[PDB]
Design a protein around this nucleic acid. Sequence first.
DNA 1: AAACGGCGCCGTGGTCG
DNA 2: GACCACGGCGCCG
Length: 546
Amino acid sequence: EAPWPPPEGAFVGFVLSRKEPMWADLLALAAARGGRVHRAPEPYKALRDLKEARGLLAKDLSVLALREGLGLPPGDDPMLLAYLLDPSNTTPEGVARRYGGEWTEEAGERAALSERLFANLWGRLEGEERLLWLYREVERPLSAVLAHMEATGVRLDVAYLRALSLEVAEEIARLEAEVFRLAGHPFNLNSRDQLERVLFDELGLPAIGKTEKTGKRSTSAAALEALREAHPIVEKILQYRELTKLKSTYIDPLPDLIHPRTGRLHTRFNQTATATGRLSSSDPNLQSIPVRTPLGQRIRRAFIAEEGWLLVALDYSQEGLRVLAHLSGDENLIRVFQEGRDIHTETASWMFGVPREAVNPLMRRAAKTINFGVLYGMSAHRLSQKLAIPYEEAQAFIERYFQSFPKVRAWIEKTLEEGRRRGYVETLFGRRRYVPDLEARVKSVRQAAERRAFNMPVQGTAADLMKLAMVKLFPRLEEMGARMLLQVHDELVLEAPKERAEAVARLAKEVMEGVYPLAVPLEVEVGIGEDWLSAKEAAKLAAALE
DNA sequence: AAACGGCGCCGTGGTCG
DNA sequence: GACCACGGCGCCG
């Protein structure tokens, strides 16, 4: 239609050989301005003719550009506009179908669609001053940060993981043999069907749980938990489950994903994938790397700094409860955080009517259960189960909780009232989620929706704050010669030359804690290490002084 | 805490061959 | 035999 190159401000369209930009061949590149499409004769060379990537999935093209040594930032992307209007807008195909046009497999058509959808979606954002603020001050600049994170990747200790694989392989084989013995015949332990036979037919154990959909007897951790003490075969299966889980999902796959050009591992940070405004991570998911068990901790050790560099790990402490304090205005919850006290200890002190010094471990763990339970509307029935106490004693506990934090109850009631009346809920900054079924006739469907309504404002506000912090911090890091590697919702992992790592840590803390004024301080824990686990361990050791 | 809701491995039954 | 969609199960915050 028109020869390459396009005029200024053109929208890009592109086709990759695969979805993962760090691995993909750029097959086709095109640009549209005024409905006129320019197709590139040779895509890679044609990248140099763009000042920025403006278009659907602009970040993905920016990542591939960075891989080829080219500093092409992402700009406007209609996906971000659509996501802000309605976070159920998660794919170009779905956005096209809903808002107009069609997502095809041809670069030129993708360029024209990008240009048209941008104008369509921009139009619908007129007068939406808070969404526009989020677009301009958070999402659009974040896309550039995410591009540098994905293209940088993270260094992995492959030999450590090769070794760890062997070690765990041995333990798996042991457990398998010990289980087969107790079964009196071999089978596939990985098969939940075979296992459901063995456990509940052959060995005749009690099955108290059902699967979610198939209506079968569950072999889940929850279903089997109460059979654990009395039945060692169960104990061995759960051990086998954990090891095979971590080996098959993490220990074995990750070494094979090291990139030949970078020597590093590259994830994707999906910016329009969640209903709450959180990022997600995929290919692989580096926001689900094990950490909680002994073996999980050992996997975290595999994530290492470049030679001469250190990882910096930063963590917003109790970000959900601090957000709740701000959103609710509950003066008692605000006071806790203002005074630097331990929310779970303080809750327990009032719950059990003891001075904070007399709070014992059982009391704190109950208060902690209650504290997080309030984020899902404070169910009395679910409280009775987790603490293993009469339903009526659960109700009493809840009443006692709301006596000390009455504006949290107020916030709960208000969130649901507005949700019911307006049809959506929102974060502090005005990110919006439409939540149906808040007046559903079926109690289970209704309550499930209520839990979504409470979730999104808290988790979504925390996401908005972390995103804004990333946007603020990233240029500062660039100046100091440091990198931003991972985000795990309330956590950031940076990488800095070892001599500057301490200053990077101090700067990052300050930016994150000062990101935005709330009724309470944001507290950020910070650790420095040669691997991800050491860095997190260091954060705790430092927290004592700090 | 893991309650929501992200993402990924696994085995299974159906389908085409 | 090769391939796929579906759902069990469970990692993380």
